[PDB]
Amino acid sequence: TKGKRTFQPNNRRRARVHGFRLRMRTRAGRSIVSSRRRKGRRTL
Amino acid sequence: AVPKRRKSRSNTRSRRSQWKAAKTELVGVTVAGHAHKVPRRLLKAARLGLIDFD
Amino acid sequence: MKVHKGDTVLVISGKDKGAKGKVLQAYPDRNRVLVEGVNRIKKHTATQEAPIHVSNVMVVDSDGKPTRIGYRVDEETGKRVRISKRNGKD
Amino acid sequence: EYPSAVAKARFVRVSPRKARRVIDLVRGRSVSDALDILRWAPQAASGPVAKVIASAAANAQNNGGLDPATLVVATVYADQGPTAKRIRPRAQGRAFRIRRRTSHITVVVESRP
RNA sequence: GAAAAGUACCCCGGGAGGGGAGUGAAAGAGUACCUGAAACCGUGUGCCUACAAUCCGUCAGAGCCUCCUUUUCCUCUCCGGAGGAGGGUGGUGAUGGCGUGCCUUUUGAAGAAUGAGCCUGCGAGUCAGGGACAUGUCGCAAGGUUAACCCGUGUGGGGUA
RNA sequence: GGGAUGAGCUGUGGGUAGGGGUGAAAGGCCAAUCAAACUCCGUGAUAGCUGGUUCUCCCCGAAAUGCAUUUAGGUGCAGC
RNA sequence: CGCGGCACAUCCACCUUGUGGUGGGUGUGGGUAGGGGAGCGUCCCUCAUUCAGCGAAGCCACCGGGUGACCGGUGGUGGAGGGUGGGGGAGUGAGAAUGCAGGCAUGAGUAGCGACAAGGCAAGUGAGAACCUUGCCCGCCGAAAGACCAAGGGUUCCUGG
Ligand SMILES: [Mg+2]
Ligand SMILES: [Mg+2]
Ligand SMILES: [Mg+2]
Ligand SMILES: [Mg+2]
Ligand SMILES: [Mg+2]
Ligand SMILES: [Mg+2]
Ligand SMILES: [Mg+2]
Ligand SMILES: [Mg+2]
Ligand SMILES: [Mg+2]
Ligand SMILES: [Mg+2]
Ligand SMILES: [Mg+2]
Ligand SMILES: [Mg+2]
Ligand SMILES: [Mg+2]
Ligand SMILES: [Mg+2]
Ligand SMILES: [Mg+2]
Ligand SMILES: [Mg+2]
Ligand SMILES: [Mg+2]
Ligand SMILES: [Mg+2]
Ligand SMILES: [Mg+2]
Ligand SMILES: [Mg+2]
Ligand SMILES: [Mg+2]
Ligand SMILES: [Mg+2]
Ligand SMILES: [Mg+2]
Ligand SMILES: [Mg+2]
Ligand SMILES: [Mg+2]
Ligand SMILES: [Mg+2]
Ligand SMILES: [Mg+2]
Ligand SMILES: [Mg+2]
Ligand SMILES: [Mg+2]
Ligand SMILES: [Mg+2]
Ligand SMILES: [Mg+2]
Ligand SMILES: [Mg+2]
Ligand SMILES: [Mg+2]
Ligand SMILES: [Mg+2]
Ligand SMILES: [Mg+2]
Ligand SMILES: [Mg+2]
Ligand SMILES: [Mg+2]
Ligand SMILES: [Mg+2]
Ligand SMILES: [Mg+2]
Ligand SMILES: [Mg+2]
Ligand SMILES: [Mg+2]
Ligand SMILES: [Mg+2]
Ligand SMILES: [Mg+2]
Ligand SMILES: [Mg+2]
Ligand SMILES: [Mg+2]
Ligand SMILES: [Mg+2]
Ligand SMILES: [Mg+2]
Ligand SMILES: [Mg+2]
Ligand SMILES: [Mg+2]
């Protein structure tokens, strides 16, 4: 682990962990998306 | 070792005035019927057309 | 506006106060009109008129003097006709 | 007193201290004597400083009708202009500031025997 | 800037930038633009400074420079102040004496204890309540005063619980 | 310099979550943070502690003692 | 002690004989924590009055004034709001918090300019060439410093500028 950094990008794992269809499965995630529409974020 | 105090206006100016360019001597050149001025170490090349006067 | 394209107008304030000219073009969303002969501009090439504010001209009533202008329902078409004050014509 | 001409050079991308090193050679000298001191000075600011003495000598001859053989650099100085700010990354996540300095250069040549 | 009338044309320059012209009431408003402070950075000029130990000031004090004025003289005399003598401002300060920064915190700090590179702007006893105690002051007075509420364009009039 | 056919190394996809995980066990590691992560809220947490608190003049002018104190660098009351 | 200015307490005289004023004695006037008294400057509102495109504010300089905070005059700059008096209300005064934001110094023309493959010349291009182009030479990698994918990146690719 010499030289290895924290962020290793992978676009399929950004979507399966943080994406829209995971947020919309639990009540905690619907309250996050409803609170980012309410603040006015362009990305949810 | 960092500086302990900022220098006063007198102490920074005395050092800074000794940063100055040494000018060079200029002698006279007539090539192609034109009076120019070159430094003396370039006098042979000025007489041979090797110096561009811009 | 109450000032139209074909109308002749009298300048009542400004540098060209007193000049009679006619409107060349009207700019309603700025309240400005172009009158021929007024505030000539020495523009550098590559003199014509500049627009003045509409509150500096008055419409001339075809009997000499300028006027504030009023309206009148013509009773036979149902559209208001722009009539003059101070002896009431057109 | 004497008939003169002014040329200014604004927003020259030369540091003002580096400009002042090369105008100390030519202060008070005549214009013919100053253009060839600045021709053979090895410093880079001697390029822009020479062109403003040259454009001051041109405005005296053209716009003033003055004799080119009688012109002298009467007044020269270098002010400063606006400074752009930059960032140089350093060790262990430090960031230092780099400054791009500019100069305003004024030349007043005057005609005198 | 009232209006873009945002600098035609000529010159120097590869450009950038400028100078002359021209516009405008004003470019001492030129798309880096209203007013344009201080720190900070130059150029010019007056005085001082290269045998002296300086919390950088203060009091004593010579000279030099500058600009105004008193007495005869250049008396061209209305002139001009022309030069000097006397006084007076303004600048500077050879030289002598005296002289241990500011804040905070301490028995006691110039302290080698703390905080402060500099300038500009901002940054700390306020407000509520028929509260409580004490007072200044005003109205009524053996009485004083209403609360919610009601009526009015309001700061006015009612309202005894 | 050690291991280098193994209790090996590695890729891809997956699983375990905060008094919880995971640990050939060092209180190691859990996004450069770990004797209880991060973020938002309670919230302007609280601090007998340290610091800061901004114009002027006039008149007067202390104390660092007693007693009590989970008290001794705090406070109440007396003294001034 | 002498001569002159100010302030406070007290006493003695009076003018509506303390709401006070004037005059004359004597006394007093270092001051931190802290207590009491009286004022200056900024801003907003109300009433009254007075300035201002024949130049308000703000700013800069010089000359003056007051016991202090501070004030006034005159001029320059500037372009639209101020001054005085009776009242009312304060986001009402900074030099310190390793305060916050912006601008700028000091260090200083100082350290550094990212591997130990290594560049040179001729010609060109252009205002400008150690670094760009072309040619030759020299050098370095060669289980990569060559050629391909994958993840990731996203127009960086090509042509003309
Ligand atoms: Mg009008
Ligand atoms: Mg890094
Ligand atoms: Mg031009
Ligand atoms: Mg011009
Ligand atoms: Mg004009
Ligand atoms: Mg103006
Ligand atoms: Mg500017
Ligand atoms: Mg400006
Ligand atoms: Mg000496
Ligand atoms: Mg000694
Ligand atoms: Mg001690
Ligand atoms: Mg003490
Ligand atoms: Mg200290
Ligand atoms: Mg010290
Ligand atoms: Mg320090
Ligand atoms: Mg071995
Ligand atoms: Mg090995
Ligand atoms: Mg082995
Ligand atoms: Mg655990
Ligand atoms: Mg242990
Ligand atoms: Mg970690
Ligand atoms: Mg815990
Ligand atoms: Mg709570
Ligand atoms: Mg607290
Ligand atoms: Mg006393
Ligand atoms: Mg105690
Ligand atoms: Mg007590
Ligand atoms: Mg005394
Ligand atoms: Mg006292
Ligand atoms: Mg006190
Ligand atoms: Mg004027
Ligand atoms: Mg104001
Ligand atoms: Mg003043
Ligand atoms: Mg004035
Ligand atoms: Mg003024
Ligand atoms: Mg005022
Ligand atoms: Mg008032
Ligand atoms: Mg008040
Ligand atoms: Mg305040
Ligand atoms: Mg300040
Ligand atoms: Mg500060
Ligand atoms: Mg800062
Ligand atoms: Mg050094
Ligand atoms: Mg070096
Ligand atoms: Mg390199
Ligand atoms: Mg070549
Ligand atoms: Mg080889
Ligand atoms: Mg390419
Ligand atoms: Mg391209």
| DSSP conformation letters of D2-59 | --EEEEEEEEESS-HHHHHHHHSSSTTSBHHHHHHHHHH--STTHHHHHHHHHHHHHH
Domain harbouring D100, CATH code: 3.90.470.10
Instruction: Judge whether residue D29 contacts strand E, using its CB and a 7 Å cut-off.
Output: no
Alpha-carbon distance of B29 to B51, in angstroms, equals 11
- The two tokens of residue D5 are 């001409």
Instruction: Judge whether residue A7 contacts strand F, using its CB and a 7 Å cut-off.
Output: yes
Alpha-carbon distance of D78 to A16, in angstroms, equals 62
Q: Quick check: C56 and C13 in contact, CB under 8 A?
A: yes
Among D17, D20, D21, D39, most B C-beta atoms within 10 A, so best to mutate, is: D39
Sign of the dihedral defined by the CA atoms of residues B18, B20, B22, B23, in that order = negative
Of the candidates D17, D11, D9, the residue with the CA atom closest to the CA atom of residue D83? D11
Phi, psi dihedrals of residue C67, rounded to the nearest 5°: -160, 155
Resolution for this PDB entry, in angstroms: 2.7
Q: What is the DSSP letter of D83?
A: -
Q: What is the span of the domain harbouring residue D70? A: 1-113
What is the three-state SS of A1-44? CCCCCCCCCCHHHHHHHHCHHHHCCCHHHHHHHHHHHHHCCCCC
Instruction: Judge whether residue D20 contacts strand G, using its CB and a 7 Å cut-off.
Output: no
**Number of domains within chain A:** 1
Domain harbouring A14, CATH code: 1.10.287.3980
Q: What is the span of the domain harbouring residue A25? A: 3-44
State how beta strands C52-53 and C32-35 pair: antiparallel
Q: Does B15 touch chain D (CB under 8 A)?
A: no
CA distance B20 to chain D (A): 6
Nearest 10 degrees: Cα torsion D50, B24, D68, B28: -130
**Number of domains within chain D:** 1
Alpha-carbon distance of D75 to D110, in angstroms, equals 9
Phi, psi dihedrals of residue D62, rounded to the nearest 5°: -80, -65
Q: What is the DSSP letter of B8?
A: P
Method: cryo-EM
Of the candidates D113, D112, D109, the residue with the CA atom closest to the CA atom of residue D62? D109
Q: Does B37 touch chain D (CB under 8 A)?
A: yes
Alpha-carbon distance of C81 to D92, in angstroms, equals 82
